[PDB]
Design a protein around this motif. Structure first.
Motif, PDB file in Angstrom:
ATOM      1  N   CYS A 162       0.825  -1.233   0.000  1.00  0.00           N
ATOM      2  CA  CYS A 162       0.000   0.000   0.000  1.00  0.00           C
ATOM      3  C   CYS A 162       0.858   1.282   0.000  1.00  0.00           C
ATOM      4  O   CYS A 162       0.419   2.316  -0.512  1.00  0.00           O
ATOM      5  N   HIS A 163       2.088   1.177   0.533  1.00  0.00           N
ATOM      6  CA  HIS A 163       3.100   2.231   0.626  1.00  0.00           C
ATOM      7  C   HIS A 163       3.738   2.618  -0.729  1.00  0.00           C
ATOM      8  O   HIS A 163       4.232   3.730  -0.852  1.00  0.00           O
ATOM      9  N   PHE A 164       3.712   1.736  -1.746  1.00  0.00           N
ATOM     10  CA  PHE A 164       4.265   2.087  -3.075  1.00  0.00           C
ATOM     11  C   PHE A 164       3.221   2.896  -3.832  1.00  0.00           C
ATOM     12  O   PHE A 164       2.039   2.531  -3.829  1.00  0.00           O
ATOM     13  N   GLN A 165       3.664   3.957  -4.516  1.00  0.00           N
ATOM     14  CA  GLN A 165       2.799   4.825  -5.313  1.00  0.00           C
ATOM     15  C   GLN A 165       1.974   4.084  -6.356  1.00  0.00           C
ATOM     16  O   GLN A 165       0.791   4.401  -6.546  1.00  0.00           O
ATOM     17  N   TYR A 166       2.608   3.134  -7.062  1.00  0.00           N
ATOM     18  CA  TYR A 166       1.960   2.359  -8.107  1.00  0.00           C
ATOM     19  C   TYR A 166       0.787   1.522  -7.596  1.00  0.00           C
ATOM     20  O   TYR A 166      -0.247   1.509  -8.244  1.00  0.00           O
ATOM     21  N   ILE A 167       0.963   0.820  -6.468  1.00  0.00           N
ATOM     22  CA  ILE A 167      -0.079  -0.017  -5.876  1.00  0.00           C
ATOM     23  C   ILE A 167      -1.212   0.887  -5.396  1.00  0.00           C
ATOM     24  O   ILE A 167      -2.376   0.646  -5.739  1.00  0.00           O
ATOM     25  N   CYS A 168      -0.844   1.957  -4.654  1.00  0.00           N
ATOM     26  CA  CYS A 168      -1.746   2.983  -4.130  1.00  0.00           C
ATOM     27  C   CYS A 168      -2.627   3.550  -5.245  1.00  0.00           C
ATOM     28  O   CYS A 168      -3.843   3.588  -5.103  1.00  0.00           O
ATOM     29  N   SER A 169      -2.011   3.892  -6.381  1.00  0.00           N
ATOM     30  CA  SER A 169      -2.676   4.397  -7.583  1.00  0.00           C
ATOM     31  C   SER A 169      -3.670   3.334  -8.161  1.00  0.00           C
ATOM     32  O   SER A 169      -4.817   3.661  -8.489  1.00  0.00           O
ATOM     33  N   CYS A 170      -3.240   2.066  -8.204  1.00  0.00           N
ATOM     34  CA  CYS A 170      -4.023   0.931  -8.676  1.00  0.00           C
ATOM     35  C   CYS A 170      -5.260   0.720  -7.790  1.00  0.00           C
ATOM     36  O   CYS A 170      -6.346   0.471  -8.312  1.00  0.00           O
ATOM     37  N   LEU A 171      -5.101   0.894  -6.463  1.00  0.00           N
ATOM     38  CA  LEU A 171      -6.179   0.750  -5.485  1.00  0.00           C
ATOM     39  C   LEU A 171      -7.281   1.786  -5.685  1.00  0.00           C
ATOM     40  O   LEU A 171      -8.463   1.420  -5.667  1.00  0.00           O
ATOM     41  N   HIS A 172      -6.895   3.068  -5.877  1.00  0.00           N
ATOM     42  CA  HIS A 172      -7.827   4.169  -6.096  1.00  0.00           C
ATOM     43  C   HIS A 172      -8.582   4.052  -7.405  1.00  0.00           C
ATOM     44  O   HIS A 172      -9.790   4.305  -7.425  1.00  0.00           O
TER      45      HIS A 172
END
Ligand SMILES: CS(=O)(=O)Nc1cc(C2=CCOCC2)cnc1Cl
Length: 863
Positions: free
Chosen positions: A142-152
C-alpha cells in the motif's frame, strides 16, 4: 581515441554547444572546472559499475513511495516472469511486502513447472510492466505509489519477476566504455573608457559604481563625472571608495551601471574583486556589459559573450602591493576570530534577545545586542544563525573573522534552515559551504522536491567550481531520476547567454559520469527536434488549410521513416519511469490556439492500459511558471498527505526543455468545464438546466453506486484547488482552464498568472461546483460544510509550512520570471498564508475570506 572523439561530439550535440567553444576561451577557471569535475564524475561512474544489484536498482529505479510512508485489505495482483507469455493472478494483502508476493509467485511457478525451485525470493525484484519502475524493499504494498494508484483507480497491478542476473546484465550494458589585512589604503579603481555605447547625443554619460556583499552595500556608491555621449566615452579618472583594501570580504563584488542623463539606463557589469584561486585582482579589465531593462548586484559576475555588439567598460585595478595578495586561509581567519569577549548580560537583557530570536527586520540597537550575544546565539538559539549573519558588519574584516570562528563550530542546522541560507542575502562562501553541509541529510525525495530551487541558486554563484555544483553532480550520478531532471533544468536554459557556460560545463561533467544516460537523453532530444519541425509544419499548414486537413498532413509527416524512428521508444522527458513506446499517429492532434500545441499519443503492448500515455509539445509559449506552480501544488499535496489528508490532486508533469519549448503530461479521461458545459445534444449528459450538465456528465461516467465516490473525489480536489489557487494567487480562472477527470477529480491548468499579477486575488467559490458538492440539491449544508472543513484543514496545514514556501519562493527570484522579480511578490504569499497571525486570527481571516467568496457565489445562485 575513436570512442573519445565520438563521445565528445555526442556531448556537444546533446548540450547544444560544441566543446571546442570551451577550449577557445583559453580560460584557466573554465579549464580547471573541466578537469576537476571530469575526475569527480568518472570516480562516481566507477563506484556505480561495481554496485550490488539492489544498489544499482536504487540508482536506476529509485522507489516511488507514498508521502505518508516516508521516513487490512485484499488485493488482486497479476505476476509474470521475464520473457513469459504465462502469468498468475493472486490475492495478497495491501500489508504484504514484495518478498511475500515474490515467494507466492515462485511457489506457483514451482507447481506449474513441476520442480522444487533453486530460486529464493531474495534473488528477485518486481518490475511494473512496461515501466522503468520496480517494487522492492521492506515496505508493505500500500506504501508504493503504483499499488496505491491501482487501489484508487480499481485497476489490477501487473508485475514482472526480474532476477538479480537480469538486473546485473542491465548494470553491465550501461557501463562507461573502457597579507590583505595590512593594506589600510581605501579601495580605488581607474575608470578608463567605454566602447560601443549607444544613447541620445543631446544627453551625457555617467558610470555609477558600488561595492556589494550580496545585496548589501559595503560602502556608499560613487559616481563618475558627466562626459558627453559618444561611441567611445573617455573618463581616465580615479573612483575612490570609503572602505579599506584590508576590509574587502572574500565575496566582494564591484558593480557598474552606465547610463545617460538629461534617467536613461544603458548597461551594467559586475566582477568579483578576488579570483577563483583567491587572488586580489590587478591590471586592466575590459568588461563586456549587459543591457539594462540602477546597480544590479544579483546579476552575473561574467561578461556578455556577444563581444561584437556589447558596450564595454575598460577599468584598471591598481597593484596594491609588489607581490600577489591572496585572501587569508581559514586557519589565519579562525586565529583572528578566536579572540573575543563573551556577552555577560542581565536576565532582562537576556529576555530581550529571546524575544527577538523567536520573533523580520530589526532596529539598530537590537542588532548591537544580537552581535554582543553571538556566543549565546550559537549555544542556545543555533537556528537563529541567519539573524546573526544579517547583523554582522561584512565591511569589517575582524567582525567577519569573529563570525566565521563561531560558524566553524556551529551545529548542523535542519534542512529548512539550510534552504534559507542558500539565499543571495548570505553570499559568504563559508556560509554557503555550511548550508550545503546541513543539506547533505536531504533524502533523494526531499532533494527532488527542491531541485528546481537548487538549480536557480547556481545563477547566484560567483565561481564555476563550487560546493553546490559538486553536491548537485554527486547526487545526480547516485540517482538516475535526479540525473534526468538536473540535465533538463540546465538544458532548457542553454539559450540564455548568462548561464550557457556554467550550465554547459555541468552537463558535460555529468555526461562524463554516465555515457549510457547521455545516449538515453540524446534519444529524447532527437524526439524533441522532430516535434519542433512537426510543430512548425502545423503552424504553417493550419493558416492555409482547414483543421482536418492540417491534422491529416501532420499524420502523413509523422508516418515518415525518420519521424517514426525518432518519436518512438524513448523515456519520457516528463518522467524517466514512463516509457514512450509506439506512437499512435491516428490519435495525435494539435490545439486551435496561436502556438498550435501538439498532442502526441503513445501505447505499449508490454505495459497494457498503463502504457497508454500522452504528451503535449508546446513551442512559442514559456512553461517555467506552470512548472513552478505545478511543483508548489505537488508540495501542498505531499504536505497534506503527511498529515493524513488526501485531496485527490492532479499535479501532472510540466517541463520546459528548450527556448520557449517544453512538455506537458496529458491526463487521459479528462475534459474541460467549458466542453462539458457546451451541453451538446445527443450525449449521455444533456441537461434541462445548464447547472445539471457537470453532474450529469459525472453520472454517465460513474454509473449506479459509483456516483457517490465521484462526487467525493470532486469535493476533495475542489477543496484542494480552492486553497492552492488562493494561497498562490492564481487568477484568470475560466471554464477552459479548469478540467475534470472521469473519476470526479477537478484540476486547474495553464498557470501563466500567479501571486495576484498587481491585484489581491480573492477566494473563489463557483456555483456549478457548489451544485456538484451538494449532490444536485439546492440546500445541503451537511455536504457543503464538509467541504468548508476540507478547505480549513488544507489551509491550516499549509500555514504550518509557510516558511518552507517562503524560502523556496525566495530562492526562485533567481529564475527571472516577470511575476517573481522582487520582495512584493513574496509579500503576496505572506498575506495569503497570514503568517504574522496566530492560528486563531488566521483561521478567523480565512473564514471571512471564504464567506466573502460564498456571498459572491450566491450572486449567481440568485438566478
Ligand atoms: C489546451 S493546451 O493548449 O494543450 N494547454 C494545456 C493543457 C494541459 C493539460 C491537458 C490535459 O492533460 C492535463 C494537462 C495543461 N496545461 C496546458 Cl497550458
Amino acid at each position: 581515441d575513436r570512442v573519445k572523439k565520438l563521445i565528445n561530439s555526442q556531448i556537444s550535440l546533446l548540450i547544444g554547444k560544441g566543446l571546442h567553444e570551451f577550449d577557445s576561451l583559453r580560460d584557466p577557471e573554465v579549464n580547471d572546472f573541466r578537469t576537476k569535475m571530469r575526475q569527480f564524475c568518472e570516480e562516481a561512474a566507477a563506484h556505480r559499475q561495481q554496485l550490488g544489484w539492489v544498489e544499482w536498482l536504487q540508482y536506476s529505479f529509485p522507489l516511488q513511495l507514498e508521502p505518508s510512508a516516508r521516513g487490512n485489505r485484499a488485493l488482486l495482483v497479476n505476476v509474470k516472469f521475464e520473457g513469459s507469455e504465462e502469468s498468475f493472478t493472486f490475492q495478497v494483502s495491501t500489508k504484504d511486502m514484495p518478498l511475500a508476493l515474490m515467494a507466492c509467485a515462485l511457489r506457483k511457478k514451482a507447481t506449474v513447472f513441476r520442480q522444487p525451485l533453486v530460486e529464493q525470493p531474495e534473488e528477485y525484484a518486481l518490475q511494473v510492466n512496461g515501466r522503468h519502475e520496480y517494487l522492492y524493499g521492506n515496505y508493505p504494498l500500500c506504501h508504493f505509489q503504483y499499488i496505491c494508484s491501482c487501489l484508487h483507480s480499481g485497476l489490477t497491478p501487473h508485475l514482472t519477476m526480474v532476477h538479480s542476473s537480469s538486473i546485473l546484465a542491465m548494470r553491465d550494458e550501461q557501463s562507461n566504455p573502457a597579507s590583505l589585512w595590512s593594506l589600510e589604503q581605501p579601495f580605488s579603481i581607474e575608470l578608463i573608457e567605454g566602447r560601443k555605447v549607444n544613447a541620445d547625443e543631446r544627453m551625457k554619460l555617467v558610470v555609477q559604481a558600488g561595492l556589494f556583499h550580496g545585496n548589501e552595500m559595503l560602502c556608499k556608491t560613487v559616481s563618475s563625472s558627466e562626459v558627453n555621449v559618444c561611441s567611445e566615452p573617455v573618463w581616465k579618472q580615479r573612483l575612490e571608495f570609503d572602505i579599506s583594501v584590508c576590509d574587502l570580504p572574500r565575496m566582494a563584488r564591484l558593480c557598474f551601471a552606465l547610463y545617460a542623463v538629461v534617467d536613461c539606463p544603458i548597461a551594467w557589469a559586475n566582477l568579483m574583486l578576488f579570483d577563483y584561486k583567491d587572488q586580489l585582482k590587478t591590471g586592466e579589465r575590459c568588461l563586456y556589459m549587459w543591457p539594462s531593462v540602477l546597480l544590479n548586484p544579483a546579476g552575473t559576475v561574467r561578461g556578455n559573450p556577444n563581444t561584437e555588439s556589447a558596450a564595454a567598460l575598460v577599468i584598471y585595478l591598481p597593484e596594491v602591493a609588489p607581490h600577489p595578495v591572496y585572501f587569508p586561509a581559514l586557519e589565519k581567519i579562525l586565529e583572528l576570530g578566536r579572540h573575543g569577549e563573551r556577552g555577560r548580560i542581565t536576565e532582562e537583557e537576556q529576555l530581550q534577545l529571546r524575544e527577538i530570536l523567536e520573533r523580520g527586520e530589526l532596529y539598530e540597537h537590537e542588532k548591537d545586542l544580537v552581535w554582543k550575544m553571538r556566543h549565546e546565539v550559537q549555544e542556545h538559539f543555533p537556528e537563529a544563525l541567519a539573524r546573526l549573519l544579517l547583523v554582522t558588519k561584512w565591511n569589517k574584516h575582524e567582525d567577519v573573522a569573529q563570525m566565521l570562528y563561531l560558524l566553524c563550530s556551529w551545529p548542523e542546522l535542519p534542512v529548512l534552515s539550510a534552504l534559507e541560507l542558500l539565499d543571495f542575502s548570505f553570499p559568504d562562501c563559508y556560509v554557503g559551504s555550511f548550508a550545503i553541509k546541513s543539506l547533505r541529510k536531504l533524502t533523494d525525495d526531499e532533494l527532488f522536491q527542491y531541485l528546481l530551487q537548487l538549480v536557480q541558486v547556481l545563477k547566484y554563484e560567483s565561481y564555476l567550481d563550487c560546493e553546490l555544483t559538486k553536491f548537485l553532480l554527486g547526487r545526480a550520478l547516485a540517482n538516475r531520476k535526479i540525473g534526468h531532471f538536473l540535465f533538463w533544468h540546465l538544458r532548457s536554459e542553454m539559450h540564455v547567454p548568462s548561464v550557457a557556460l556554467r550550465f554547459g560545463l555541468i552537463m558535460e561533467a555529468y555526461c562524463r559520469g554516465s555515457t549510457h544516460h547521455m545516449k538515453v537523453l540524446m534519444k529524447q532530444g532527437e524526439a524533441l527536434s522532430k516535434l519542433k519541425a512537426l510543430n512548425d509544419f502545423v503552424k504553417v499548414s493550419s493558416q492555409k488549410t482547414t483543421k482536418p486537413q492540417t491534422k491529416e498532413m501532420m499524420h502523413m509527416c509523422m508516418r515518415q521513416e525518420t519521424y517514426m524512428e525518432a518519436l518512438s521508444h524513448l523515456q519520457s522527458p516528463l518522467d524517466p519511469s514512463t516509457l514512450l513506446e509506439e506512437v499512435c499517429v491516428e490519435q495525435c492532434t494539435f490545439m486551435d490556439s496561436k502556438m498550435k500545441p501538439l498532442w502526441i499519443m503513445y501505447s505499449s503492448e508490454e505495459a497494457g492500459s498503463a502504457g497508454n500515455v500522452g504528451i503535449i509539445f508546446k513551442n512559442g509559449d514559456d512553461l517555467r511558471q506552470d512548472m513552478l506552480t505545478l511543483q508548489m501544488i505537488q508540495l501542498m499535496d505531499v504536505l497534506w498527505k503527511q498529515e493524513g489528508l488526501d485531496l485527490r490532486m492532479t499535479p501532472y508533469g510540466c517541463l520546459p526543455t528548450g527556448d520557449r519549448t517544453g512538455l506537458i503530461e496529458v491526463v487521459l479521461h479528462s475534459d474541460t468545464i467549458a466542453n462539458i458545459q457546451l451541453n451538446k445534444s445527443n450525449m449521455a449528459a444533456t441537461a434541462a438546466f445548464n447547472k445539471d450538465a457537470l453532474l450529469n456528465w459525472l453520472k454517465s461516467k460513474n454509473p449506479g453506486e459509483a456516483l457517490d465516490r465521484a462526487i467525493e473525489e470532486f469535493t476533495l480536489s475542489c477543496a484542494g484547488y480552492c486553497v492552492a489557487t488562493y494561497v498562490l494567487g492564481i487568477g484568470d480562472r475560466h471554464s477552459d482552464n479548469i478540467m475534470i477527470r472521469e473519476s470526479g477529480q477537478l484540476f486547474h491548468i495553464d498557470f501563466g498568472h500567479f501571486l495576484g499579477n498587481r491585484e489581491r486575488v480573492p477566494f473563489i467559490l463557483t456555483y456549478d461546483f457548489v451544485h456538484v458538492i451538494q449532490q444536485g440539491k439546492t440546500n445541503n449544508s451537511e455536504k457543503f460544510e464538509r467541504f468548508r472543513g476540507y478547505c480549513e484543514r488544507a489551509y491550516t496545514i499549509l500555514r504550518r509550512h509557510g516558511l518552507l514556501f517562503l524560502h523556496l519562493f525566495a530562492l526562485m527570484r533567481a529564475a527571472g520570471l516577470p511575476e517573481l522579480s522582487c520582495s512584493k511578490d513574496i509579500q503576496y504569499l505572506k498575506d495569503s498564508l497570514a503568517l504574522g497571525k496566530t492560528e486563531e486570527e488566521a483561521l478567523k481571516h480565512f473564514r471571512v475570506k471564504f464567506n466573502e467568496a460564498l456571498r459572491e457565489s450566491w450572486k449567481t445562485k440568485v438566478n
